[PDB]
Write an enzyme that holds these catalytic residues in place. Structure first.
Site, PDB file in Angstrom:
ATOM      1  N   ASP A  46       0.610  -1.525   0.046  1.00 35.29           N
ATOM      2  CA  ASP A  46      -0.192  -0.159   0.150  1.00 35.29           C
ATOM      3  C   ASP A  46       0.596   1.493   0.037  1.00 35.29           C
ATOM      4  OD1 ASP A  46      -2.792   0.639   0.355  1.00 35.29           O
ATOM      5  OD2 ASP A  46      -1.914   2.128   1.941  1.00 35.29           O
ATOM      6  N   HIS A 113      -7.968   9.031  -1.837  1.00 39.12           N
ATOM      7  CA  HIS A 113      -7.575   8.950  -1.129  1.00 39.12           C
ATOM      8  C   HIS A 113      -8.632   9.348   0.464  1.00 39.12           C
ATOM      9  CE1 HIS A 113      -3.357   9.610   0.991  1.00 39.12           C
ATOM     10  NE2 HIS A 113      -3.991   8.807   1.977  1.00 39.12           N
TER      11      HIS A 113
HETATM   12  N1  LIG Z   1      -5.616   6.275   2.778  1.00 35.51           N
HETATM   13  C1  LIG Z   1      -6.232   6.581   4.502  1.00 35.51           C
HETATM   14  O1  LIG Z   1      -6.509   8.063   4.709  1.00 35.51           O
HETATM   15  C2  LIG Z   1      -4.770   6.018   5.159  1.00 35.51           C
HETATM   16  C3  LIG Z   1      -4.002   4.915   4.637  1.00 35.51           C
HETATM   17  N2  LIG Z   1      -2.289   4.235   5.922  1.00 35.51           N
HETATM   18  C4  LIG Z   1      -1.765   2.929   4.784  1.00 35.51           C
HETATM   19  O2  LIG Z   1      -2.219   2.209   6.158  1.00 35.51           O
HETATM   20  C5  LIG Z   1      -1.556   1.562   6.306  1.00 35.51           C
HETATM   21  C6  LIG Z   1      -1.510   2.203   8.243  1.00 35.51           C
HETATM   22  O3  LIG Z   1      -0.888   1.927   9.315  1.00 35.51           O
HETATM   23  P1  LIG Z   1      -0.093   2.982  10.149  1.00 35.51           P
HETATM   24  O4  LIG Z   1      -0.986   3.529  10.695  1.00 35.51           O
HETATM   25  O5  LIG Z   1       0.647   4.089   9.463  1.00 35.51           O
HETATM   26  O6  LIG Z   1      -0.013   1.992  11.355  1.00 35.51           O
HETATM   27  P2  LIG Z   1      -0.299   0.863  11.764  1.00 35.51           P
HETATM   28  O7  LIG Z   1      -1.116   1.044  13.363  1.00 35.51           O
HETATM   29  O8  LIG Z   1      -0.192  -0.386  10.454  1.00 35.51           O
HETATM   30  O9  LIG Z   1       1.129   0.341  12.881  1.00 35.51           O
HETATM   31  C7  LIG Z   1       1.694   0.045  13.544  1.00 35.51           C
HETATM   32  C8  LIG Z   1       2.628   0.520  13.919  1.00 35.51           C
HETATM   33  O10 LIG Z   1       3.224  -0.351  15.281  1.00 35.51           O
HETATM   34  C9  LIG Z   1       4.575  -1.097  14.762  1.00 35.51           C
HETATM   35  N3  LIG Z   1       4.308  -2.506  14.600  1.00 35.51           N
HETATM   36  C10 LIG Z   1       4.110  -3.219  13.314  1.00 35.51           C
HETATM   37  N4  LIG Z   1       4.705  -4.016  13.224  1.00 35.51           N
HETATM   38  C11 LIG Z   1       4.566  -4.850  14.951  1.00 35.51           C
HETATM   39  C12 LIG Z   1       4.340  -5.474  15.881  1.00 35.51           C
HETATM   40  N5  LIG Z   1       4.766  -7.339  14.935  1.00 35.51           N
HETATM   41  N6  LIG Z   1       4.719  -5.767  16.785  1.00 35.51           N
HETATM   42  C13 LIG Z   1       4.502  -4.732  17.818  1.00 35.51           C
HETATM   43  N7  LIG Z   1       4.829  -3.221  17.151  1.00 35.51           N
HETATM   44  C14 LIG Z   1       4.537  -3.385  15.696  1.00 35.51           C
HETATM   45  C15 LIG Z   1       4.944  -0.533  14.192  1.00 35.51           C
HETATM   46  O11 LIG Z   1       6.223   0.525  13.362  1.00 35.51           O
HETATM   47  P3  LIG Z   1       7.319  -0.254  13.955  1.00 35.51           P
HETATM   48  O12 LIG Z   1       7.604   0.414  12.243  1.00 35.51           O
HETATM   49  O13 LIG Z   1       8.370   0.543  14.202  1.00 35.51           O
HETATM   50  O14 LIG Z   1       7.712  -1.923  13.495  1.00 35.51           O
HETATM   51  C16 LIG Z   1       4.388   0.749  13.501  1.00 35.51           C
HETATM   52  O15 LIG Z   1       4.736   2.160  13.440  1.00 35.51           O
HETATM   53  C17 LIG Z   1      -0.060   3.368   6.428  1.00 35.51           C
HETATM   54  O16 LIG Z   1       1.448   2.493   6.243  1.00 35.51           O
HETATM   55  C18 LIG Z   1      -0.420   3.390   4.913  1.00 35.51           C
HETATM   56  O17 LIG Z   1      -0.355   2.575   3.759  1.00 35.51           O
HETATM   57  C19 LIG Z   1      -3.037   5.266   7.175  1.00 35.51           C
HETATM   58  C20 LIG Z   1      -2.994   5.910   7.138  1.00 35.51           C
HETATM   59  C21 LIG Z   1      -3.986   6.473   6.130  1.00 35.51           C
HETATM   60  C1  LIG Z   2      -9.133  13.479   7.602  1.00 34.62           C
HETATM   61  C2  LIG Z   2      -7.433  12.556   8.180  1.00 34.62           C
HETATM   62  O1  LIG Z   2      -7.126  12.846   6.586  1.00 34.62           O
HETATM   63  C3  LIG Z   2      -6.149  12.281   6.399  1.00 34.62           C
HETATM   64  O2  LIG Z   2      -4.661  12.544   6.754  1.00 34.62           O
HETATM   65  C4  LIG Z   2      -4.535  13.744   6.196  1.00 34.62           C
HETATM   66  C5  LIG Z   2      -3.182  14.567   6.705  1.00 34.62           C
HETATM   67  O3  LIG Z   2      -1.991  13.728   6.017  1.00 34.62           O
HETATM   68  C6  LIG Z   2      -1.018  14.883   6.626  1.00 34.62           C
HETATM   69  O4  LIG Z   2      -0.079  13.519   6.558  1.00 34.62           O
HETATM   70  C7  LIG Z   2       0.265  12.329   7.355  1.00 34.62           C
HETATM   71  C8  LIG Z   2       0.013  11.558   7.158  1.00 34.62           C
HETATM   72  C9  LIG Z   2      -0.406  10.004   6.369  1.00 34.62           C
HETATM   73  C10 LIG Z   2      -2.113  11.355   5.538  1.00 34.62           C
HETATM   74  C11 LIG Z   2      -2.249  10.691   4.273  1.00 34.62           C
HETATM   75  C12 LIG Z   2      -2.542   8.144   4.630  1.00 34.62           C
HETATM   76  O5  LIG Z   2      -2.693   7.269   3.874  1.00 34.62           O
HETATM   77  C13 LIG Z   2      -1.037   7.946   5.353  1.00 34.62           C
HETATM   78  O6  LIG Z   2      -1.201   6.710   5.670  1.00 34.62           O
HETATM   79  C14 LIG Z   2      -0.606   8.951   6.383  1.00 34.62           C
HETATM   80  O7  LIG Z   2       0.949  10.473   8.421  1.00 34.62           O
HETATM   81  C15 LIG Z   2       1.078  10.856   9.232  1.00 34.62           C
HETATM   82  C16 LIG Z   2       1.892   9.549  10.287  1.00 34.62           C
HETATM   83  C17 LIG Z   2       2.696   9.956  11.517  1.00 34.62           C
HETATM   84  O8  LIG Z   2       2.982   9.444  12.040  1.00 34.62           O
HETATM   85  C18 LIG Z   2       3.379  11.181  11.224  1.00 34.62           C
HETATM   86  C19 LIG Z   2       3.089  12.474  10.184  1.00 34.62           C
HETATM   87  O9  LIG Z   2       3.537  13.658  10.211  1.00 34.62           O
HETATM   88  C20 LIG Z   2       2.167  12.110   9.594  1.00 34.62           C
HETATM   89  C21 LIG Z   2       1.582  13.271   8.118  1.00 34.62           C
HETATM   90  O10 LIG Z   2       1.932  14.280   8.086  1.00 34.62           O
HETATM   91  C22 LIG Z   2      -0.294  15.413   5.995  1.00 34.62           C
HETATM   92  O11 LIG Z   2       0.871  16.226   5.862  1.00 34.62           O
HETATM   93  C23 LIG Z   2      -1.981  16.999   6.439  1.00 34.62           C
HETATM   94  O12 LIG Z   2      -1.459  17.732   5.499  1.00 34.62           O
HETATM   95  C24 LIG Z   2      -2.790  16.170   5.863  1.00 34.62           C
HETATM   96  O13 LIG Z   2      -3.983  17.026   6.266  1.00 34.62           O
HETATM   97  C25 LIG Z   2      -5.389  10.667   6.311  1.00 34.62           C
HETATM   98  O14 LIG Z   2      -6.533   9.540   6.187  1.00 34.62           O
HETATM   99  C26 LIG Z   2      -6.414  10.355   8.492  1.00 34.62           C
HETATM  100  O15 LIG Z   2      -5.940   8.843   8.927  1.00 34.62           O
HETATM  101  C27 LIG Z   2      -8.143  10.920   8.396  1.00 34.62           C
HETATM  102  O16 LIG Z   2      -8.596  11.644   9.485  1.00 34.62           O
END
Ligand SMILES: NC(=O)C1=CN([C@@H]2O[C@H](COP(=O)(O)OP(=O)(O)OC[C@H]3O[C@@H](n4cnc5c(N)ncnc54)[C@H](OP(=O)(O)O)[C@@H]3O)[C@@H](O)[C@H]2O)C=CC1
Ligand SMILES: C[C@@H]1O[C@@H](OC[C@H]2O[C@@H](Oc3c(-c4ccc(O)c(O)c4)oc4cc(O)cc(O)c4c3=O)[C@H](O)[C@@H](O)[C@@H]2O)[C@H](O)[C@H](O)[C@H]1O
Length: 319
Positions: A46, A113
């Site tokens: 992803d 997204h």
């Molecule tokens: N479309 C959207 O709006 C969004 C999409 N995403 C996507 O989905 C993923 C969601 O994951 P995200 O929120 O980033 O993080 P996760 O919730 O997957 O993160 C788990 C965290 O726990 C740690 N971890 C991983 N495996 C283990 C394990 N076995 N035991 C203990 N700790 C563990 C990692 O740290 P460490 O690296 O130190 O292992 C990681 O930072 C993203 O990377 C991205 O690709 C995320 C947010 C929004």
């Molecule tokens: C409405 C929000 O939209 C998205 O975030 C939007 C924000 O993302 C921020 O982008 C970031 C995202 C992020 C965002 C989307 C993803 O799909 C994703 O995988 C990651 O993840 C972080 C994780 C961290 O540990 C530290 C960080 O500074 C950031 C970060 O800045 C931008 O810097 C902001 O300007 C932006 O407004 C996510 O879906 C979020 O979960 C949701 O609640």
């Protein structure tokens, strides 16, 4: 590994590798860990334009293909259309740029997204003279029509959405002349926010719910309240971990797999990357599942308060 058949006819591995790492993490790391993930067994990867890593993730994929570890058709790669490219004419060009960055001919899945449109432009976070992010008004149905064109053009094998609530999904599903339904809806999903209502709805329309922050998020102090409960430290999850001789992360991941949710898992640590694929080695009991079901507290880790005023803010609805 295990796959789920999309309403597309295409298949998606039920376990995916999350590639997002904060800006402070060198981009070379994304290249290194993606190779480690593929070597560990991950086949679903992803990514997104916003992550500033598609080039590295693509390089990793090309590398594992070159050394004969896998073939392109064995990898399920997903990218996402950022909110500043919602206007229909900017969709294909956005996809093409991601493809060029990743050095790929197609993405297995392209997603909108977020439903919250932002002012069109190269800048991913447009803000006005008073420091406020600039919203844009776009009919997401037209954005979807553009997405459908990308799938017809072969640039994306499958198309779906992310961060959509029931109402927003229905907008697409009810669109006159709809050609392709979204194959999935990727949303924040974990024991503290299990999305059971949305999950049931998605199931009824044959749409797959893909869980992000399934392990409790990366908890960055810039977007996650330090006072928010630490998911992996949940007494119930920890109790089940010690009982099954696994880890809380593996428990949280297995939970999703058993309720029909595709789960993403981010880790830039080789040992944890390898541990995460072990989610297929054990099973939770029906009682274990009910126990986890009761952990829900409607907790969204990312502080999206700044978008609360957006007409497309998805968290206004009950679901
Ligand atoms: N479309 C959207 O709006 C969004 C999409 N995403 C996507 O989905 C993923 C969601 O994951 P995200 O929120 O980033 O993080 P996760 O919730 O997957 O993160 C788990 C965290 O726990 C740690 N971890 C991983 N495996 C283990 C394990 N076995 N035991 C203990 N700790 C563990 C990692 O740290 P460490 O690296 O130190 O292992 C990681 O930072 C993203 O990377 C991205 O690709 C995320 C947010 C929004
Ligand atoms: C409405 C929000 O939209 C998205 O975030 C939007 C924000 O993302 C921020 O982008 C970031 C995202 C992020 C965002 C989307 C993803 O799909 C994703 O995988 C990651 O993840 C972080 C994780 C961290 O540990 C530290 C960080 O500074 C950031 C970060 O800045 C931008 O810097 C902001 O300007 C932006 O407004 C996510 O879906 C979020 O979960 C949701 O609640």
């Amino acid at each position: 590994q295990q796959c789920v058949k999309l309403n597309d006819g295409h298949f998606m591995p039920v376990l995916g590798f999350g590639t997002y790492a904060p800006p402070e993490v060198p981009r070379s790391k994304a290249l290194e860990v993606t190779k480690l993930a593929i070597e560990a067994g991950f086949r679903h990867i992803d990514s997104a334009h916003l992550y500033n890593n598609e080039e590295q993730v693509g390089l990793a994929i090309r590398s594992k293909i070159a050394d004969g570890s896998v073939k392109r058709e064995d990898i399920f790669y997903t990218s996402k259309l950022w909110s500043t490219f919602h206007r229909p004419e900017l969709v294909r060009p956005a996809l093409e740029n991601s493809l060029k960055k990743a050095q790929l001919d197609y993405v297995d899945l392209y997603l909108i997204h977020s439903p919250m449109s932002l002012k069109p432009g190269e800048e991913l976070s447009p803000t006005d003279e008073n420091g406020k992010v600039i919203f844009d008004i776009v009919d997401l149905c037209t954005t979807w029509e553009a997405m459908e064109k990308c799938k017809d053009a072969g640039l994306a094998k499958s198309i779906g959405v992310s961060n959509f609530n029931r109402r927003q999904l229905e907008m697409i599903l009810n669109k006159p002349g709809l050609k392709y339904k979204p194959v999935c809806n990727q949303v924040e999903c974990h024991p503290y926010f299990n999305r059971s209502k949305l999950l049931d709805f998605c199931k009824s329309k044959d749409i797959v719910l893909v869980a992000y922050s399934a392990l409790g998020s990366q908890r960055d102090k810039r977007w996650v309240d330090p006072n928010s409960p630490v998911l992996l430290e949940d007494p119930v999850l920890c109790a089940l971990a010690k009982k099954h001789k696994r880890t809380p992360a593996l428990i949280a991941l297995r939970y999703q797999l058993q309720r029909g949710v595709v789960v993403l898992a981010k880790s830039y640590n080789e040992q944890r990357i390898r541990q995460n694929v072990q989610v297929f080695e054990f099973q939770l009991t029906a009682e274990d599942m009910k126990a986890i079901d009761g952990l829900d507290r409607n907790l969204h880790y990312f502080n999206s308060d700044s978008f609360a005023s957006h007409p497309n803010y998805p968290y206004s609805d009950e679901y």
